Amino acid sequence: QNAQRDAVTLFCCLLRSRLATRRVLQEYRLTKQAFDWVLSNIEAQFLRSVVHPGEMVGVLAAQSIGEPATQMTLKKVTSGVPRLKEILNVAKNMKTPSLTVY
Amino acid sequence: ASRHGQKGTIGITYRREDMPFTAEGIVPDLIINPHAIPSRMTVAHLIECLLSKVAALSGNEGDASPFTDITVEGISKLLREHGYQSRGFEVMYNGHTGKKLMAQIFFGPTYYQRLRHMVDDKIHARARGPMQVLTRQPVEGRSRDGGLRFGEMERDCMIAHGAASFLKERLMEASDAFRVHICGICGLMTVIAKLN
Amino acid sequence: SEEGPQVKIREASKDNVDFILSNVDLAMANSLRRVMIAEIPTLAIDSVEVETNTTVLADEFIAHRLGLIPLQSMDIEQLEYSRDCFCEDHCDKCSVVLTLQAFGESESTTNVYSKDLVIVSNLMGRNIGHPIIQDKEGNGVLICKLRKGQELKLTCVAKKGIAKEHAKWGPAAAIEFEYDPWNKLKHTDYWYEQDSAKEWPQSKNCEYEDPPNEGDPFDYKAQADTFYMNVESVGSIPVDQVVVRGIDTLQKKVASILLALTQM
Amino acid sequence: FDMGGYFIINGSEKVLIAQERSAGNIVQVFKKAAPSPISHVAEIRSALE
Amino acid sequence: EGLVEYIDAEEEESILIAMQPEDLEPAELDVDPAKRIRVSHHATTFTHCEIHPSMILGVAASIIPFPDHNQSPRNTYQSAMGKQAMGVFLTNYNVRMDTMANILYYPQKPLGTTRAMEYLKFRELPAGQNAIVAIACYSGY
Amino acid sequence: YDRKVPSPTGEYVKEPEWVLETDGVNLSEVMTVPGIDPTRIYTNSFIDIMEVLGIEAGRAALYKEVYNVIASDGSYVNYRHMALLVDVMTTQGGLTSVTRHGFNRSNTGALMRCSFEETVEILFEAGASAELDDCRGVSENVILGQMAPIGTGAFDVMID
Amino acid sequence: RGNLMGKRVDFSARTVISGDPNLELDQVGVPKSIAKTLTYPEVVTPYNIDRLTQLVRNGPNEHPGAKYVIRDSGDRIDLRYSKRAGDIQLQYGWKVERHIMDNDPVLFNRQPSLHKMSMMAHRVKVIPYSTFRLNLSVTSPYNADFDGDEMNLHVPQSEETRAELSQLCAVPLQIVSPQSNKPCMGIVQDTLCGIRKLTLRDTFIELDQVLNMLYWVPDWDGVIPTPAIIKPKPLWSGKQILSVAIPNGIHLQRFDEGTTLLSPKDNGMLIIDGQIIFGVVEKKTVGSSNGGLIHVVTREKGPQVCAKLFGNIQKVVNFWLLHNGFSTGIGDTIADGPTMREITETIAEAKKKVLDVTKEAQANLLTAKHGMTLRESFEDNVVRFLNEARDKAGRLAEVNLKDLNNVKQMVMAGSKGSFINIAQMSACVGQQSVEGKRIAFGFVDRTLPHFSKDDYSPESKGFVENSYLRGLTPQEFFFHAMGGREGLIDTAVKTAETGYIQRRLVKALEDIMVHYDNTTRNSLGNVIQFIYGEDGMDAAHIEKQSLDTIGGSDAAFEK
Amino acid sequence: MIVPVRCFSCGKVVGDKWESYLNLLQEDELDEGTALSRLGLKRYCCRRMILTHVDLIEKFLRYNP
Amino acid sequence: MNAPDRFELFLLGEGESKLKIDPDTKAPNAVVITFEKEDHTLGNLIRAELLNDRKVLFAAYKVEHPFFARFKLRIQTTEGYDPKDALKNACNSIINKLGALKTNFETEWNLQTL
Amino acid sequence: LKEKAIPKDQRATTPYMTKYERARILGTRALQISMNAPVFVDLEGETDPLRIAMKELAEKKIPLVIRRYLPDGSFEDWSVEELIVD
Amino acid sequence: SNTLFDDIFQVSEVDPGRYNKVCRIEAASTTQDQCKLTLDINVELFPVAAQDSLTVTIASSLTRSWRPPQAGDRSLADDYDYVMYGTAYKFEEVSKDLIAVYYSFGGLLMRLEGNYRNLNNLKQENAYLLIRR
Amino acid sequence: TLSHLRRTNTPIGRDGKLAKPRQLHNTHWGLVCPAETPEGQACGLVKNL
RNA sequence: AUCGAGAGGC
Ligand SMILES: [Mg+2]
Ligand SMILES: [Zn+2]
Ligand SMILES: [Zn+2]
Ligand SMILES: [Zn+2]
């Protein structure tokens, strides 16, 4: 249940921000039935938005990163595909080692 | 293709009736999309179009050689001297309806080339054809009536979709499926089985 | 004259007619020129049986050339479609047989014009299958060239068809077509750099209509009812018959629609 | 219009493609990488003509 | 007669090439705005002059009309595709028994010709046709 | 850098600040210098960060660097995917590379490992160590031509 | 890697592709040859025995036909060479390997398969000609083009396989991709330029065209919308007619720069219940954009409604465009005399600034700014000056472009074309570069043997003040070519490096599956995450919404 | 490789005109523009059929057998 | 290799009726006619003529695929007006105008010299 | 192990039918119907086995049961009847 | 089914914008210096000069598929010169008892402000605009 | 045929990320065609005179 | 079947 509250924390922040009493009654003008309808739709859309078990999210991640890297095209730092190759292959001898000091 | 990397295939064939036409009655042999123009910046294609128009009207040659003092402005002066719009545009009427196109159209002679790639020489299809000898997999190649490769780069996508049974079929029922007998003690296919 | 559409011929020739179509809606003129292009029937070679070919061209090259040759089709209506007739392959009521045999006799190069075609089959007295010849020197279209020692022996069978099946059956070519030289209809938006007027050439048909007043507002309810056409014929059918037969073919299509409605 | 410049081996026409190499008997000087124990090198590729 | 010379890559290190013989005319304004911008050479100690700059191109590139108005990758693409266009590859095609041959029925010489086409014999063995092209949106096909 | 920070009134406002950009990395030393903020300093050498600030800092800087290589090209990939990549590189002890020398050395079966690179050597090492492949990996079943435990084959189906 | 992890397979086909504006999104144009070549095993049941007998009697040589029949005994029966190919007695439980027919599920693919959206289920439409045909709006997920690309088709062989295609790999499902949490398909070039032109406030349509468009929308209610203008002539607006494609129940609100609710330049977009109120429709509205129209209609209405939406928008806009017309020409690359003059005067002022900074560097009067050499300072300054000149001339050009300029229109719609394309084609093509620097001294202390030694002039090191319209001088030509070569090499090399990287990513994370307890694990069960994405949501149906709590004065927050 | 019968674009027969064209160039020593005009070839669709033509057949004839 | 025989552009086959007629759904007094082996030449003219009959509410045609020679014409008329009668009247008006065109043209051509 | 079941009350897996198990179930039923197996719905003019299975689903007359497996080996049996479809 | 607003306005500022057949015209009420409006007008059909005075009217009638005027029998509700049909999308509460309404006639917009039309212009899809010369 | 007869190969590598040998070099002016070269792999290695 | 070369799409 702690993990549950943690997972839903941020979306609940958005919820309370949007379903704030003075907002519901002054910014929107929701009626009773309209409010309960918003509630049911929210819960339904949430439950539908949950990820489905069985999803092979690993291949999905790999493809979702590799595809836009195939369109990675051409002012001081190694960027793009050379940088990505430096990152994945753990590159101890990187070409633009920098340090940003605040 | 044309002589400027503007390559492409034929999508449709229209008879002269359905083709758009100018008041002179002239009809395009070819129709290419304006959207292939600005992304490649192949201005020479359009200059060629303009020059070829003025040459065909003049019965002279088109000095499309590079590093010359031939300008678009002089070409246009000539073309207008021949009674056409200087930038090469022409009012054109729809072929289906015959109402003027609200847009005037760039339209003229341009050298095009027929490339060595043709569909009936690329087309292939196979369903349970010849198999290879060693792997017992489909043979490689159209000229041998083989099967396309279901590469692992595609097995990846089939996994990301989640289609387990389609993947097994592509891997067993559509290629080199086989059945062997194995011993419940030594887990190796060394069993001699008279099925008859 | 007859109440309805109005015609006024500006110029007329054996090969082309420049006229005006008044009190007509656009769709009619457009379907008329579409029919004038595709739906009107003529006669042209649709089969070739080749016996000897020592020429530098392949057989199919020559066959494609022959199909394109203009043949007389004035009386084509009295000839029937081979698909419609009852013969085995072709007859005299459905097809015309030409023959072409020439030999490279002379040391100099020997041409083969369309005039060298010989009509074998029985015409049964109709203006049909005559290779069209408008050349000043009487020769036809240059079909092939022969060296001393080459010959060519073949038999063409001309049938009846329309340009839809193949463009060889096209009775006309290059139908000029314009309406509203002044764009009073606001049917096209002129692309320009400085002045659309000075940057677009005036149409020749601007003379036959009065220019508008710059202060007069847009005549919005006016529609297009006057057309400037110029129909040119290769010669397989005279221009007058090209346009009249197109009119009648259009009418015949509408008629078939009527009859099918009745059968329903 | 034939231009020649090809051979005819067993019916098939063959072309000899120009093979590109660096010229020998010329002296070139090349720096060495940072982790190299030696600093520079002078090389000449002595070839008997 | 000493009017022309053979210069290789090494020797041209020691020379100053002019581009057009007009670069040797003296100078002592009202110009055509449409022509390209050619900088004054500002050099005088010339030893040679290019025969014609268009000669920096290969056989294939000398087919491209106005390659000075194109993104160079397009010129490269075309130089790779011009070797795939059909046409009369030889006048004796009917005699040669080649594994594959493709001949254009009615080849046309282009209406836009490079001066270098004459020495390439392209107007005598063309590989395309002057198609009437319309750039237009029409049915979206 | 024109960074944003809350005004005392509460609304965010742009407050620029001077920042130092170097041409080299020794984090353990630069960190302990006076006059700096030892809580906001940053490196593109995420491996030095794993060395100094622990493994989770490494995860965070790793994700940040991948995010930047994507967003440099104006593109955008959702958080979860880069997250999964970074976590996989970090879920082990420390930084595991996506190479034959990194991930391919784990105990993740034997047929799955041989399917990437160095195939016959993996198979020899397994035949020596008497490895027992679980046959629960994807590539194991793909090789065996069976329905792998994937979204559709992630369970059984039976009768009521 | 060549016979186990991937192999050649039966029931496959491959050929060229072209596009059909009259095909559905999930539809795929299958040539009749291939349909006669590929088979599906269908079992005989009371529901099919009539159709299956008809197909067997129809024969393998003409479609819809069948090729083989499989009895209970298990002996194959070849319909090409058999006495009894006419009098067939189909018994229940037999198998007819029927032809591929309309609305069959096929897997459609284009290599390189970088995507789940690169292998997608399609509905079969058997077509006459020899090319594969697909909807324009399905190109972007495949990265396909009609310049010679070829595509592959695989055919399922069991009912569960067809089910896995239709219910998981179908096209409308994969509209919103989990990658980038947005739609991967949108309205594209022709339809895009046309939908812009149509939805202009200046665009009115007469009755006849209106009725033809109305009928063109398939799932049309059959109710003519009340015209916008009535009195002098009953007229509709391009907006009004296009709104018939949008399903009722759709709200879309978006504000651009200076988007008053009066929107004097038709900015933004306001669409109320399948009818639009104001806003020119363009790429931002109807592209494959986050929070676009496709995002909405897929989330609210669903996948199939959005696929029909693709179809209807395309059909209406393509009709209107076909009867409207569009072209490019070179006249859309000419700026007028005064603009060209200002452009060349700008190039001259940039040349003067470069000359001045060069002379200053020559007199050793440079300030050695920390961290960089004198030469590095010099090169940075001159490159900056020339880029500023190119950009200023390009904006000088784009200002002079009129609204009728079709290049400007394609840019405005977002169909194709960018500012830099305009700048280079008409204003100035720019500075050429190799390995990040200007044209290097390949010869001894010069770039070309037409230059005096030690000439750091703008053009001597690769600056092209001439435009593609004007024409490049031979040195400019050679330098441009020198840069383009680097470009082609970088492309050809990035391709292979990305292929390797992608393969390694996939082979590393392949076994990562979200299990039933939401724990993201691998083959060994070793946990990689405890909540997928740390919130356990699918990457699709996730949208960029604002958090009104952050930001704003505490005063306004309290208020 | 030989004069096409008619223009591809419009269809006006041109095959009957080749030998005239050449003679209009050689007999009358005209230029190709006026020569094409004299033959009723006004549309440029027609004009390019003759102007861009290459009678390769004259080479093919030179091969003896 | 896959091209259809060109005669299929005008040549009906295997009981393909020229006209097929279907009542429209959710449309009072409306009907859709599927013309077979015809193109814009006919449909454009029939529709533009139906637009002149003041008792026609709706009239439009469409070619669902240029591959095929066929098209769809939907007509909605007033109550008590079988649209087939509107189609007939339009067609007959077409034919009358065409006959008058032919006669006037022949008049002008025989009047014309050369 | 030996009877590693889970009591039907203390079940924490999703009560909703995942798209993957839905597609697998529909495919299994369409397979059963491809062969002559009985159909438990009044097919209102439906022939395609897939649509028949989908309608058997909407009326929840599909007598199958999913066995969701947990990485420890524990599993939960879920009738198609109780599983929610959305 | 009758009129919901009536007034006479004097043309103040007409601007073409980047369009060629449409202008955006801002006008104010006559004899009343407190109520004003802006509106998109097709100038090709109905021209609008500066400082004109055009009678402006809004009606709610005079769902069902549109049909053209069959004959003169159709009794128009419009002896005016320029008529349009649109939808109200916003009612702007400008100030205390100062209201404004936003209309869209297929993209041609309208903004109207005042408070002598309050009791009439409801949130109705139904809306007709009429202009007498 | 001509382009094939004026082709040069540079065998220093078949597969590798070699940018320097491939790029168009200043010295190639007038001797090698700047643009005519294969696409993709072996770009800039195979040249035409 | 092995090896080699050329080409297509990114
Ligand atoms: Mg491509
Ligand atoms: Zn044993
Ligand atoms: Zn007969
Ligand atoms: Zn012509």
Q: For residue G105, give the chain B residue with the closest CA.
A: B166
Q: For residue J27, give the chain F residue with the closest CA.
A: F152
Residues facing G235 on adjacent strands: G229
Tokens read off for I50: 């139906």
H or E element that contains K114: strand K108-114
- CATH number, position B162: 3.90.1800.10
- Give the largest Cα separation in chain B, rounded: 97
Q: Return the closest nucleotide (C1') to the Cα of B140.
A: M1
Please report which residue ranges of G401-473 form alpha helices under DSSP H. Answer: 406-413, 419-422
Domain of I25, in residue numbers: 6-111
In L1-49, beta strands by DSSP E: 7-9, 47-48
| Total residue count of chain A as it appears in this document | 102
Binding-site residue numbers of G are: 145, 147, 149
What is the rounded (10 degree) CA torsion for B128, B129, B130, B134?
Answer: -30
Cα–Cα distance between F22 and K69 in angstroms, integer?
Answer: 80
Tokens 């219940």 locate to G273
Judging by beta carbons within 10 Å of its beta carbon (0-12, 13-18, 19+), is residue C138 exposed, middle or buried?
exposed
User: What is the distance in angstroms measured between the alpha-carbon CA of B119 and the sugar C1' of M8?
Assistant: 12
Cα–Cα distance between I30 and G221 in angstroms, integer?
Answer: 12
User: Is the CB of residue G158 less than 8 Å away from at least one CB of chain J?
Assistant: yes
Chain J positions in Cβ-Cβ contact with residue B165 (cut-off 8 Å): 24, 27
**Contact between G404 and G326 (Cβ < 8 Å):** no
Chain K positions in Cβ-Cβ contact with residue G401 (cut-off 8 Å): none
User: What's the gap in Å between G148 CA and the centre of ligand 1?
Assistant: 7
Angle at B156 between CA J75 and CA G511, to 5 degrees: 40
For chain E, the straight-line distance linking the first and the last C-alpha, in angstroms and rounded, comes to: 62
User: Is the CB of residue B62 less than 8 Å away from at least one CB of chain H?
Assistant: no
Beta-carbon neighbours within 5 Å of ion ligand 3: C 85, 87, 91, 94
Angle at B162 between CA B156 and CA B168, to 5 degrees: 75
Rg of chain I, C-alpha, whole Å: 18
Cα–Cα distance between I51 and I90 in angstroms, integer?
Answer: 9
**Can you spell out the DSSP letters for F59-111?**
HHHHHHHHHHHHHTTT----HHHHHHHHHHHHSSSS---SSTTTGGGSSS-SH
User: What is the distance in angstroms measured between the alpha-carbon CA of D14 and the sugar C1' of M1?
Assistant: 26
B183 assigned ligand-binding residue: yes
Closest ligand to the CA of B109: 4
**Can you spell out the DSSP letters for chain E?**
--S-----TTGGGG--EESSGGGGS-------TTS--PPP-------EE-S-GGGGS-TTGGGSSSGGGB-HHHHHHHHHHGGGB-S-S-TTTTT---S-----SS-B--SEE-TTHHHHTTTTS--EEEEEEEE--STT-
Cα–Cα distance between C149 and E33 in angstroms, integer?
Answer: 62
> Crossing angle of helices F79-90/G474-509, nearest 10°?
60
Residue F153 and residue B159: Cβ atoms within 8 Å?
A: no
- Give the largest Cα separation in chain A, rounded: 64
Method: X-ray
* Of G399, G401, G394, nearest in space to G419 by CA: G394
Cα–Cα distance between G275 and G307 in angstroms, integer?
Answer: 18
Residue G435 and residue L19: Cβ atoms within 8 Å?
A: yes
**Contact between G423 and G398 (Cβ < 8 Å):** yes
Cα–Cα distance between G290 and G270 in angstroms, integer?
Answer: 16
Q: Count residue pairs from C and I with Cβ separation < 8 A.
A: 123
User: What's the gap in Å between I44 CA and the centre of ligand 4?
Assistant: 27
H46 assigned ligand-binding residue: yes
Cα–Cα distance between H44 and K59 in angstroms, integer?
Answer: 59
- Resolution of the coordinates in A? 3.3
Give whole-number Cα distances, A23 to A35, F73, G3, G555, I34, in Å. 12, 39, 63, 16, 57
Number of H helices and E strands in chain D, helices first, is 0, 5
Angle at C196 between CA C194 and CA C201, to 5 degrees: 120
- CATH number, position I100: 3.30.1360.10
CA C72 to chain centroid: 12
Binding-site residue numbers of C for Zn(2+) are: 85, 87, 91, 94
Tokens read off for J2: 């030996």
Tokens 């022709």 locate to G190
Q: Return the closest nucleotide (C1') to the Cα of A70.
A: M10
> Crossing angle of helices I40-50/G207-216, nearest 10°?
120
Compute the nearest-CA separation of J74 from chain G (Å). Answer: 11
Angle at K25 between CA K24 and CA K28, to 5 degrees: 150
User: What's the gap in Å between C143 CA and the centre of ligand 4?
Assistant: 19
User: What's the gap in Å between C80 CA and the centre of ligand 3?
Assistant: 7
* Closest by Cβ to C2, choosing from I6, I9, I100: I100
Torsions phi, psi of H13, nearest 5? -65, 135
**Contact between C225 and C20 (Cβ < 8 Å):** no
Q: Return the closest nucleotide (C1') to the Cα of L39.
A: M7
Q: Based on the structure, what is the number of domains in chain H?
A: 1
Cα–Cα distance between G40 and B128 in angstroms, integer?
Answer: 12
Using the Cα atoms of residue G272, residue G274, residue G279 and residue G284 in order, give the sign of their dihedral: positive
**Contact between C115 and C131 (Cβ < 8 Å):** yes
Interface of K with C in 68-127 (CB under 8 A): none
Do at least 3 CB pairs under 8 Å connect H with E? yes
User: What's the gap in Å between B20 CA and the centre of ligand 4?
Assistant: 15
Tokens 């600056």 locate to G463
Chain I positions in Cβ-Cβ contact with residue B14 (cut-off 8 Å): 66
Residue F160 and residue J67: Cβ atoms within 8 Å?
A: no
Q: Helix or strand or coil: residue G313?
A: helix
Contacts of F6 (CB under 8 A, 6+ apart): F12, F13
Domain of G224, in residue numbers: 189-323
User: Is the CB of residue A56 less than 8 Å away from at least one CB of chain B?
Assistant: yes
Chain C positions in Cβ-Cβ contact with residue I92 (cut-off 8 Å): 258
Closest ligand to the CA of B192: 2
User: What is the 3-state secondary structure of G148-160?
Assistant: CCEEEEECCCCHH
Chain I positions in Cβ-Cβ contact with residue B119 (cut-off 8 Å): 1
Residue G472 and residue E69: Cβ atoms within 8 Å?
A: yes
Tokens read off for I61: 């045609």
Residues facing E134 on adjacent strands: B31, B107
Residue E72 and residue L1: Cβ atoms within 8 Å?
A: no
Cα–Cα distance between K77 and K60 in angstroms, integer?
Answer: 11
Cα–Cα distance between B64 and B61 in angstroms, integer?
Answer: 9
Chain I positions in Cβ-Cβ contact with residue C165 (cut-off 8 Å): 6-7, 9
Angle at C176 between CA C175 and CA C180, to 5 degrees: 140
**Contact between J32 and G177 (Cβ < 8 Å):** no
User: What's the gap in Å between B191 CA and the centre of ligand 2?
Assistant: 8
Q: Find chains touching chain J: ≥3 CB pairs under 8 Å.
A: A, B, F, G
Q: Is residue I56 part of a domain?
A: yes
What is the rounded (10 degree) CA torsion for G196, G201, G205, G207?
Answer: 130
Q: Based on the structure, what is the number of domains in chain I?
A: 1
Q: Is residue I1 part of a domain?
A: no
- CATH number, position G226: 1.10.274.100
Torsions phi, psi of I23, nearest 5? -70, 135
User: Is the CB of residue C206 less than 8 Å away from at least one CB of chain B?
Assistant: no
* Closest residue, by C-alpha, to the C1' of M8: G148
Q: For residue C134, give the chain H residue with the closest CA.
A: H16
| Total residue count of chain H as it appears in this document | 65
Cα–Cα distance between E104 and E127 in angstroms, integer?
Answer: 7
Closest ligand to the CA of H8: 4
CA B87 to chain centroid: 30
| Total residue count of chain J as it appears in this document | 86
DSSP class of residue L5 equals: H
Interface of H with E in 11-40 (CB under 8 A): none
